[PDB]
């Protein structure tokens, strides 16, 4: 993909591929609340990194128009305000307030850098994507069981991670404090680059942590012991040794000198820890420190946060921010995600059904199913 | 001496309505039902704490009076919009307000000011120039609507003064269709001669009551006058309450043969009662068990229902109070009575006269006229009269005693649904 | 200190008697004010004409109530001192705006506190028990807490009953919580 | 309910939401104001001297409440006239002090603090039944799980509540609350969440109640400070309210 080719393709996509009808269905939420779509904030990033916010639109036609006119490189969705953002200058000071917004989570592979060995920075590979695969299951289950949020849209971020939009009416009316509470409840791996032991579970395992460890276990052997090989050599297993009390460290080292496979080393570590009881949760702390999602509480706490819009185009990879089907999560491949160049090649190879002829169709289908569920909830209620 | 030797006893000094025989007879209150007019507002029947008026409360009461009357008049006249009195007006505008005098003296055509309400004018005043008004009749405290112009922003020039709109009369129910005509004898104090405390005129009136057997006897105060020469100079050897108790016992016991419903109205000149208007009813006398159903201690003012006939009454000398302040372009008493009826208050004068203490919350609650009364008893120091003002029979029976000489009372016949001729006949007669 | 004292003219001699306390004199020479006339040559006891004292008290109470309800207002500005009976609806934050100068507030000439204090003073000049406890000294209290004054005590109680009755009808002993909390 | 009583005072504790509408005497006004000032000053002194959970604090506060005759204990008898009187006292005195303690932010804060303390103490003296009654009368709608559902989530509940024993847990009943009200509990993960509801045992609840109370009270004080000009004109009540904070007791 040639990023100099981005300015050539962006218009066509925004003209014949961007799913505006479903997009308006989403952000309009069945028209129940008046001025809901009209008070939504958008922000655009144009060529040469020119940023504009407090953009609002009257209806789908105005949005389609101004978007096709601007051809933005980035589209971010923001809060629904007390008035129309376009007229925020006209609103008396203090009377312009963000009132409702989806509850959103951003999980970014870059935040896992201190604990992955295959890639670094913005590089991803099939060996590390399983971490995202774990996160979506660990988090989404909580959101479906502990909090009872029923309408959850998971979206690929385009490069390094995934976003989650929780769109239940209750989740859209949550205050800042309630959002911060939700984020802290879901958050376990606490600490920066200056801390080595980032998980310190108490004697009692809270049911949520038990279910997160249960989800982790299913994948741990493949991710950590086979793929990541977190015990390949001394430079790496020294870390895991650094994560357990010194008392057994020596006892482990000799054992790790006689083990040929990291699965064997894990068995040995588990046996040694079991023999050594307050430390019976130490293996769980290691698993969490290598598998549990990291959440930027600043992303989810603030109501006025602008997050990458679904079906955006990644300025560098060119991939489309496509929704991820929860059931088919295990089959999701971030490298097969349609790029803008591929879908423009597909478009120029054959009115409201043009996208069905591209590789974008199944993802718009997943989005349509999610919107159908939202409509059913709006009606039934 | 002078009173006892009078020669014009029983003379009919004024007459109105159907001619009747030289002798009047009543039903002795047999088929008679006397009550207080059942309107939306509760009546004043017990003492209310007074002597504590906040200037803000007076402001609110006066403002709401102006606002309410103006709202009724605006609905009646289909007026579009009221304009602030104080603002300048180059073209003709309609303004609602109340009249007043720019100084403490008596109102004259060159001292008229219009004060607006809080809703439309923020309470601002404006001088009024009555040069372009051809016909007018204004008294202080009168709520008016005027069309005029204010070119200088400093002097309002009315060009039209909207007329008053009296309340509708009462539509009686059929419950009293078959009741006979009722006889009412009304008298007002003072009841004793200026130089005596024996109540000779009261005794003569009680004899008349027992002779004629009226259905209702309306006695208006004062019963122990504060201006009585004996009272002011402290020559009385008994307490005021004792004299008043003796007077009330005389009235009630002496009327036993007549079986006549007595309606006692207090006066601001009653030295023994609370000096506040609206005046609560008397409460220092407990009638015997045989007179409880006959005696009605009512408040000043009172709206009474007698077999469906609505009688308004007040002891206050309204005509004397307003005659001293009313200014007209060109019958004066008829004009004042129409003013009272159209303002829909038993005391529309503001500021009041120097001889009346007004509690303005009680005034707001208990001086609105529910309807236009069929008969309106307005005793006055002015001459007795029986006038027909906008279909209401206004009776001034004078006062039973005029200084050293005897005075007058009134007798009238009322029947609901007669002919609107609810007052069959009325007569001011000498004692 | 700003309240008018009770003036009663002796029926016999006609000399004014000013009453400002229940008791007059010092030591064993102290007696209730209404026991002896202020004129030494006069032997009349005002306690004999207690009906007249009652009537004069009622007349004075009527006079003060009339003064209060006259509603006289004076401008607080020294250079205006406008005196009016009419309360204007135009108000500043401090109260009615004087319509003569349009720049100062109208204050009541006889406010509610003045009338309340006058009635309280008339009660004070007839409060036997309060005078005995507070005003009177020890030896004087002993001399006054015997017989030979029981009739005077009863008459003083009756006279205080009048002022108590009047004060019971004043809104300045009741607090309307509806007006405070809204 | 002797002569002029009613259902106006159901429970001892109240949020002081509805102002009184009665006509009281000046003597009653002053007595109630001073008495509640004494109570609040005692609360402040005991809070400074002792730890609010201490038994000395509870004993001294009960002694003060008994001495000044304020409602502090429930009574499973009925609304006895005397009890009614006490409750009426409390209700009127509170609002009087509001009028006294709304002029200055400092004063406001002080008032709020003392009131909260008193409320906490009184809540601490409420039996579970009474507690639920209160939580219902004010439409707080904080529940109660069934026994069958409790057995259904037995292990989850056991691992949720810190330091809860198997049998002791069997002896306890939980309540279902929307998680938006248990922020302080959920945030450190000390209460189980299932389908948007937290399962809260029968110590922390007072905190939530107090939060609500504080919100309301602050709002009320603001409104009172906004309605001050109407009261300053009443000389009778000016010496008291303007100087209550500096009144010797
Ligand atoms: Zn990788
Ligand atoms: Zn003498
Ligand atoms: Zn002035």
DSSP C73-102: EEES-TTT--EESPPPS-B-SSSBBPTTTS
Q: Report the 10 Å Cβ neighbour count for D192.
A: 23
The residue among B135, B161, B187 that closes a domain is B161
Interface of chain A against chain D, CB under 8 Å?
145-149, 170, 174-175, 177-178, 180-182, 184-185, 204-210
- In eight-state DSSP terms, residue C40 is T
Residue A181 and residue D186: Cβ atoms within 8 Å? yes
Q: Name the catalytic one among A64, A76, A102, A106.
A: A106
Does A336 map to a domain?
Answer: yes
Residue C113 and residue D20: Cβ atoms within 8 Å? no
Which of D21, D23, D100 should we substitute to test contact with C (largest number of C Cβ atoms within 10 Å)?
Answer: D23
Cα-atom radius of gyration of chain B, to the nearest Å? 23
Same domain membership, residue B110 and residue B32: no
Does B345 map to a domain?
Answer: no
> CA-CA distance, D65 to D77, in Å (whole number)?
20
The residue ranges of DSSP E strands in chain D, in sequence order, are 23-25, 175-178, 193-194, 197-200
C164 exposed, middle or buried (CB, 10 Å; 0-12, 13-18, 19+)?
middle
Does B328 map to a domain?
Answer: no
Chain D meets chain A (3+ C-beta pairs below 8 A): yes
Which of B47, B50, B51, B70 should we substitute to test contact with C (largest number of C Cβ atoms within 10 Å)?
Answer: B51
The residue among A291, A319, A335 that closes a domain is A291
> CA-CA distance, A21 to A60, in Å (whole number)?
8
Same domain membership, residue B155 and residue B89: yes
Residues in a beta bridge with B156: B128
Residue B55 and residue C95: Cβ atoms within 8 Å? yes
User: Before B278, cis peptide (omega within 30)?
Assistant: yes
To 5 degrees, how large is the angle CA D191–CA D193–CA D196? 140
In chain C, helix, strand, coil percent, each to 5? Answer: 45, 15, 40
Strand B261-265 with B216-220, pairing: parallel
Tokens of B249: 């016992």
Same domain membership, residue A260 and residue A342: no
- The H or E element containing residue A152 is strand A152-156
Domain count, chain A: 2
| Tokens 């006939």 found at | B309
Residues in a beta bridge with B99: B114
CB distance C73 to C107 below 8 Å? yes
Same domain membership, residue A263 and residue A308: no
B344 exposed, middle or buried (CB, 10 Å; 0-12, 13-18, 19+)?
buried
Tokens of A364: 């718009």
Q: What are phi and psi of B76, to 5 degrees?
A: -65, -40
- Of all residues in chain C, the one with the smallest CA distance to D225 is C181
In chain A, helix, strand, coil percent, each to 5? Answer: 50, 15, 35
The sign one gets for the Cα dihedral A86, A92, A98, A99 is: negative
Residue partners of B154: CB distance under 8 A and separation at least 6: B126, B127
Q: Can A267 be counted among the known catalytic residues?
A: no
CB distance B403 to B386 below 8 Å? no
- In eight-state DSSP terms, residue C105 is B
Which of C105, C117, C180, C182 should we substitute to test contact with D (largest number of D Cβ atoms within 10 Å)?
Answer: C180
Same domain membership, residue A240 and residue A279: yes
**Phi-psi region for residue B72, left (φ > 0), alpha (ψ -120 to 50) or beta?**
alpha
- In eight-state DSSP terms, residue C145 is S
CB distance B118 to B40 below 8 Å? no
Closest CA of chain D from C179, distance in Å: 8
| Ligand 3 midpoint to CA B226 (Å) | 36
CB distance B120 to B73 below 8 Å? no
Note whether B55 contacts C: Cβ–Cβ < 8 A.
Answer: yes
Same domain membership, residue B280 and residue B391: yes
Closest CA of chain C from B185, distance in Å: 31
Same domain membership, residue B310 and residue B272: yes
CB distance D67 to C152 below 8 Å? no
Residue A279's domain comprises: 207-291
Strand B401-402 with B385-389, pairing: unpaired
Domain count, chain B: 2
Q: Where are the alpha helices (DSSP H) in chain A?
A: 6-16, 20-28, 60-70, 129-145, 169-172, 176-186, 207-220, 234-242, 246-257, 262-275, 282-291, 297-301, 340-347, 361-380
Cα-atom radius of gyration of chain C, to the nearest Å? 21
Same domain membership, residue B374 and residue B298: yes
Closest CA of chain B from C104, distance in Å: 15
First to last CA, chain C: 37
- In eight-state DSSP terms, residue A76 is E
* Three-state secondary structure call for residue A52: strand
Q: What are phi and psi of B218, to 5 degrees?
A: -100, 110
Nearest one of B132, B131, B142, B147 to B89, comparing CA atoms: B147
Q: What is the dihedral of CA D178, D179, D184, D187, to 10 degrees?
A: 170
Q: Which residues from chain C sit within 8 angstroms of residue D237, using beta carbons?
A: 175, 180
> CA-CA distance, B84 to B97, in Å (whole number)?
9
Q: Which residues from chain A sit within 8 angstroms of residue D179, using beta carbons?
A: 147, 178, 181
- Of all residues in chain A, the one with the smallest CA distance to D179 is A147
Would you mind telling me the total number of residues written for chain C in this entry?
A: 182
Does C128 map to a domain?
Answer: yes
Does C91 map to a domain?
Answer: no
Does B373 map to a domain?
Answer: yes
> CA-CA distance, D95 to D114, in Å (whole number)?
14
Q: Report the 10 Å Cβ neighbour count for A234.
A: 11
> CA-CA distance, D210 to D195, in Å (whole number)?
26
Closest CA of chain B from C40, distance in Å: 23
Residue D23 and residue C181: Cβ atoms within 8 Å? no
Tokens of A351: 């009115």
| Tokens 């040794």 found at | A241
> CA-CA distance, C21 to B260, in Å (whole number)?
51
| Ligand 1 midpoint to CA A362 (Å) | 26
> CA-CA distance, D232 to D242, in Å (whole number)?
9
| Tokens 């001192």 found at | C81
| Ligand 3 midpoint to CA C106 (Å) | 7
The beta-carbon neighbor of A147 closest among D155, D162, D193 is D193
Q: Can A146 be counted among the known catalytic residues?
A: no
Q: Which residues from chain D sit within 8 angstroms of residue A211, using beta carbons?
A: none
CB distance A24 to A63 below 8 Å? yes
Rounded to the nearest angstrom, the gap between the alpha carbon of residue B312 and the centroid of all alpha carbons in its chain is 7
First to last CA, chain B: 15
> CA-CA distance, B262 to B252, in Å (whole number)?
8
| Ligand 2 midpoint to CA C13 (Å) | 4
Closest CA of chain B from C30, distance in Å: 29
Q: What is the dihedral of CA D206, D207, D209, D213, to 10 degrees?
A: 130
User: Before B351, cis peptide (omega within 30)?
Assistant: yes
Q: Can A168 be counted among the known catalytic residues?
A: no
Rounded to the nearest angstrom, the gap between the alpha carbon of residue B367 and the centroid of all alpha carbons in its chain is 10
Same domain membership, residue B60 and residue B26: no
Q: What is the dihedral of CA A121, A125, A130, A135, to 10 degrees?
A: 30
Residue A178 and residue D180: Cβ atoms within 8 Å? yes
> CA-CA distance, B170 to B150, in Å (whole number)?
41
CB distance D162 to D203 below 8 Å? no
Same domain membership, residue A161 and residue A25: yes
| Ligand 1 midpoint to CA A210 (Å) | 27
First to last CA, chain A: 46
Does A201 map to a domain?
Answer: no
Rounded to the nearest angstrom, the gap between the alpha carbon of residue B166 and the centroid of all alpha carbons in its chain is 15
Q: What is the 3-state secondary structure (H, E, C) of chain B?
A: CCCCCCCCCCCEEEEEECCCCCCCCCCCCCCCCEEECCCCCCCCCCCCCECCCCHHHHHHHHHHHHHHHHHHHHHHHCCCCCCCCCCCEEEEEEEEEEEEECCCCCCCCCCEEEECCHHHHCCCEEEECCCCCCCCEECCCCEEEEEEEECCCCCEEEEEECCCCCCCCCCCCHHHCCCCCEEEEEEECCCCCCCCCCCHHHHHHHHHHHHHCCCEEEEECCCCECCCHHHHCCCCCCCHHHHHHHHHHHHHHHCCCCCCEEEEECCCCECCCCCCECECCCCCCCCCCCCCCCEEECCECEEEEECCEEEEECCCCHHHHHHCCCEECCCHHHHHHHHHHHHCECCCCCCCCCCCCECHHHHHHHCECCCCCCEEECCCCCCCEEEEECCEEEEECCCCEECCEECEEEEEEECCCCCCCCEEEEEEEEC
Does C126 map to a domain?
Answer: yes
Nearest one of B423, B342, B343 to B386, comparing CA atoms: B423
- A164 annotated binding-site participant: no
CB distance D39 to D94 below 8 Å? no
Nearest one of B364, B359, B361 to B277, comparing CA atoms: B359
> CA-CA distance, B382 to B36, in Å (whole number)?
28
| Tokens 């010496």 found at | D239
The residue among A291, A322, A351 that closes a domain is A291
CATH architecture of D26-138+205-246: Up-down Bundle (1.20)
Q: Name the catalytic one among A64, A76, A100, A108.
A: A108
Residue partners of B360: CB distance under 8 A and separation at least 6: B53, B57, B58, B61, B62
**Phi-psi region for residue A270, left (φ > 0), alpha (ψ -120 to 50) or beta?**
alpha
| Ligand 3 midpoint to CA C76 (Å) | 7
Interface of chain C against chain D, CB under 8 Å?
93, 113, 172-182
Nearest one of B387, B374, B349 to B15, comparing CA atoms: B387
> CA-CA distance, A159 to A319, in Å (whole number)?
8
Q: What are phi and psi of C73, to 5 degrees?
A: -120, 140
Same domain membership, residue B191 and residue B155: no
Does B183 map to a domain?
Answer: yes
Residue C175 and residue D227: Cβ atoms within 8 Å? no
Same domain membership, residue A316 and residue A280: no
CB distance D66 to C147 below 8 Å? no
Q: Where are the domains of chain D?
A: 26-138+205-246, 147-200
Does B329 map to a domain?
Answer: no
CB distance B259 to B215 below 8 Å? no
CATH of the domain at B308: 3.60.21.60
CATH of the domain at C130: 1.10.3200.20
Experimental method, per PDB record: cryo-EM
> CA-CA distance, B413 to B426, in Å (whole number)?
6
Residue B424, CB-side half-sphere exposure with 13 Å CA sphere: 16
Tokens of B276: 């506040």
Residues 124 to 183 of D: which have CB under 8 A from any C CB? none
Q: What are phi and psi of B299, to 5 degrees?
A: -95, 160
Q: Report the 10 Å Cβ neighbour count for B228.
A: 21
Q: Where are the alpha helices (DSSP H) in A146-296?
A: 169-172, 176-186, 207-220, 234-242, 246-257, 262-275, 282-291
CB distance A293 to A306 below 8 Å? no
The residue among B161, B180, B200 that closes a domain is B161
Residue partners of A166: CB distance under 8 A and separation at least 6: A102, A103, A104, A105, A143, A149, A151, A152
The beta-carbon neighbor of A185 closest among D156, D162, D186 is D186
Residues in a beta bridge with A105: A164
> CA-CA distance, A105 to A296, in Å (whole number)?
8
Domain count, chain C: 1
Interface of chain C against chain B, CB under 8 Å?
9, 51-52, 54-56, 58-59, 62, 65-66, 68-71, 83-91, 95-96, 99, 108, 112, 115-116, 169-172, 174
Residue B135's domain comprises: 55-161
Q: Report the 10 Å Cβ neighbour count for B104.
A: 12
Touching C (3+ Cβ pairs <8 A), the chains are B, D
Does B331 map to a domain?
Answer: no
The beta-carbon neighbor of D194 closest among A145, A177, A182 is A145
Nearest one of B247, B364, B378 to B311, comparing CA atoms: B378
Closest CA of chain C from D120, distance in Å: 26
* Three-state secondary structure call for residue A252: helix
Residues in a beta bridge with C6: C19
Nearest one of A362, A357, A324, A317 to A339, comparing CA atoms: A317
> CA-CA distance, C158 to D151, in Å (whole number)?
79
Residue partners of B7: CB distance under 8 A and separation at least 6: none
Q: Which residues from chain D sit within 8 angstroms of residue C113, using beta carbons?
A: 235
Q: What are phi and psi of B406, to 5 degrees?
A: -70, 155
Q: Which residues from chain A sit within 8 angstroms of residue D164, using beta carbons?
A: none
């Amino acid at each position: 993909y040639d990023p100099a080719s981005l300015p050539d393709v962006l218009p066509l996509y925004y003209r014949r591929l961007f799913p505006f009808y479903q997009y308006f269905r989403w952000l309009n939420y069945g028209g129940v609340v008046k001025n809901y779509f009209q008070h939504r904030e958008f922000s655009f990033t144009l060529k040469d990194d020119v940023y504009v916010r407090y953009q609002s639109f009257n209806n789908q036609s105005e949005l389609e128009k101004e978007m096709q006119k601007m051809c933005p490189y980035k589209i971010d969705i923001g809060a629904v305000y007390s008035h129309r953002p376009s007229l925020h200058n006209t609103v008396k000071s203090g009377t312009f307030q963000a009132q409702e917004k989806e509850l959103v989570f951003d999980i970014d592979m870059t935040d896992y850098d201190d604990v992955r060995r295959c890639c670094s920075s913005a590089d991803i590979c099939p060996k590390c994507w399983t971490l995202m695969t774990i996160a979506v299951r660990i988090l989404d289950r909580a959101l479906a069981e502990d909090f009872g949020f029923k309408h959850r849209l998971w979206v690929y971020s385009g490069r390094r991670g995934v976003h989650c939009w929780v769109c239940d009416d209750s989740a859209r009316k949550l205050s800042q404090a309630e959002r911060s509470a939700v984020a802290e409840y879901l958050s376990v791996v606490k600490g920066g680059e200056e801390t080595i032991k980032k998980v310190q579970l108490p004697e009692t395992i809270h049911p949520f942590i038990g279910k997160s460890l249960k989800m982790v276990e299913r994948y741990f052997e493949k991710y950590a012991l086979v793929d990541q090989d977190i015990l390949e050599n001394k430079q790496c297993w020294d870390k895991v040794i650094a994560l357990v009390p010194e008392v057994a460290r020596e006892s482990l080292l000799r054992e790790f000198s006689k083990a040929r496979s990291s699965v064997e080393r894990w068995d040995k570590l588990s046996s040694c820890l079991e023999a050594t009881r307050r430390y019976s949760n130490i293996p769980k702390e290691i698993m969490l420190q290598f598998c549990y999602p990291r959440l930027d509480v600043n992303v989810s706490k603030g109501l006025n946060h602008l997050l990458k819009s679904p079906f955006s185009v990644h300025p560098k990879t060119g991939r489309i921010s496509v929704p991820i089907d929860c059931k088919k999560l295990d089959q999701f491949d971030p490298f097969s995600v349609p790029t803008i160049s591929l879908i423009c090649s597909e478009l120029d190879n054959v009115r409201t059904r043009d996208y069905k002829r591209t590789s974008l169709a199944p993802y718009i289908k997943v989005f349509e199913q999610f919107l159908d569920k939202l409509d059913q909830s709006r009606k039934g209620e | 001496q002078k009173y006892g030797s009078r020669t014009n006893r029983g003379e009919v000094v004024t007459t109105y309505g159907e001619l009747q025989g030289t002798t009047w007879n009543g039903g002795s209150g047999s088929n008679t039902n006397v009550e207080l007019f059942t309107s939306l507002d509760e009546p004043l029947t017990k003492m209310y704490k007074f002597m504590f008026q906040k200037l803000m409360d007076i402001r609110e009461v006066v403002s709401i009076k102006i606002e309410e009357l103006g709202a009724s008049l605006k609905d009646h006249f289909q007026i579009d919009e009221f304009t602030s009195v104080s603002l300048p007006a180059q073209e003709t505008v309609t303004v609602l307000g109340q009249i007043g005098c720019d100084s403490n003296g008596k109102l004259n055509s060159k001292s008229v000011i219009l004060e607006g309400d809080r809703e439309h004018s923020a309470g601002m005043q404006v001088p009024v120039d009555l040069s372009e008004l051809k016909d007018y009749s204004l008294f202080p405290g009168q709520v008016v609507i005027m069309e005029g112009t204010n070119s200088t922003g400093r002097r309002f020039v009315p060009t039209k003064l909207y007329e008053g709109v009296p309340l509708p009369f009462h539509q009686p129910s059929k419950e009293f269709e078959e009741c006979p005509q009722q006889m009412v004898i009304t008298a007002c104090g003072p009841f004793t001669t200026s130089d005596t405390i024996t109540y000779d005129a009261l005794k003569d009136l009680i004899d008349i009551v027992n002779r004629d057997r009226p259905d209702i006897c309306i006695l208006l105060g004062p019963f122990l006058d504060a201006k009585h020469e004996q009272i002011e100079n402290l020559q009385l050897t008994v307490t005021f309450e004792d004299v008043f108790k003796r007077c009330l016992k005389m009235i009630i016991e002496g009327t036993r043969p007549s079986g006549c419903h007595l309606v006692i109205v207090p006066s601001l000149r009653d030295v023994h009662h609370d000096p506040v208007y609206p005046q609560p009813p008397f409460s220092c006398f407990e009638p015997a068990k045989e007179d409880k159903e006959r005696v009605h201690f009512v408040a000043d003012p009172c709206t009474l229902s007698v077999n469906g006939v609505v009688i308004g009454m007040t002891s206050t000398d309204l005509l004397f109070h307003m005659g001293a302040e009313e200014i007209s372009s060109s019958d004066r008493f008829s004009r004042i009575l129409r003013h009272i009826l159209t303002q829909r208050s038993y005391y529309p004068l503001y500021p009041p006269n120097e001889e009346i203490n007004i509690d303005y919350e009680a005034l707001y609650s208990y001086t609105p006229m529910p309807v236009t009364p069929d008969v309106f008893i307005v005793p006055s120091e002015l001459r007795y009269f029986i006038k027909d003002v906008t279909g209401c029979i206004c009776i001034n029976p004078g006062r039973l005693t005029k200084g050293l000489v005897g005075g007058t009372y009134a007798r009238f016949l009322v029947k609901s649904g007669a002919m609107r001729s609810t007052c069959i006949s009325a007569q001011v007669v000498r004692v | 200190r700003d309240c008018e004292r009770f003036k009663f003219f002796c029926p016999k001699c006609g000399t004014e008697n000013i009453y400002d306390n229940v008791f007059d004199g010092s030591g064993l020479q102290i007696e209730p004010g209404l026991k002896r006339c202020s004129k030494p040559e006069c032997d009349a006891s005002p306690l004999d004409y207690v009906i007249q004292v009652h009537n004069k008290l009622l007349l004075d109470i009527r006079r003060y109530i009339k003064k209060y309800y006259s509603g006289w207002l004076v401008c607080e500005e020294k250079t205006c001192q406008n005196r009016t009976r009419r309360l204007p609806l135009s108000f500043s934050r401090n109260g009615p705006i004087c319509q003569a100068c349009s720049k100062a507030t109208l204050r009541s000439e006889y406010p509610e506190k003045a009338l309340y204090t006058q009635l309280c003073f008339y009660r004070f000049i007839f409060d036997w028990d309060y005078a005995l406890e507070k005003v009177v000294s020890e030896q004087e209290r002993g001399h006054l807490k015997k017989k030979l004054f029981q009739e005077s005590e009863n008459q003083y109680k009756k006279l205080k009953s009048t002022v108590d009755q009047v004060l019971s009808r004043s809104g300045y002993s009741e607090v309307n919580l509806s007006k405070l909390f809204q | 309910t002797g002569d002029r009583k009613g259902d106006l005072y159901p429970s001892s504790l109240q949020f002081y939401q509805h102002p009184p509408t009665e006509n009281i005497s000046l003597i009653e006004f002053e007595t109630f104001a001073i008495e509640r000032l004494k109570l609040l000053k005692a609360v402040e002194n005991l809070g400074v001297s002792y730890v609010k959970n201490s038994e000395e604090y509870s004993k001294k506060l009960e002694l003060e409440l008994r001495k000044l005759k304020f409602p502090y204990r429930p009574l499973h008898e009925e609304i006895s006239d005397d009890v009614y009187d006490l409750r009426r006292k409390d209700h009127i005195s509170h609002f009087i002090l509001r009028l006294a303690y709304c002029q200055s932010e400092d004063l406001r804060r002080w008032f709020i603090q003392q009131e909260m303390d008193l409320f906490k103490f009184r809540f601490g003296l409420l039996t579970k039944e009474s507690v639920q009654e209160f939580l219902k009368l004010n439409d707080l709608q904080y529940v109660a799980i069934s026994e069958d559902e409790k057995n259904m989530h037995k292990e989850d509940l056991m691992n949720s509540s810190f330091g809860l024993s198997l049998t002791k847990m069997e002896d306890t009943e939980f309540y279902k609350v929307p998680f938006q009200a248990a922020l302080d509990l959920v945030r450190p993960r000390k209460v189980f969440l299932w389908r948007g509801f937290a399962f809260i045992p029968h110590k922390d609840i007072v905190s939530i109640v107090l939060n609500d109370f504080r919100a309301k009270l602050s709002k009320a004080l603001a409104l009172s400070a906004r309605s001050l000009p109407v009261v300053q004109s009443d000389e009778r009540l000016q010496p008291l309210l303007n100087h209550l904070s500096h009144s010797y007791i």
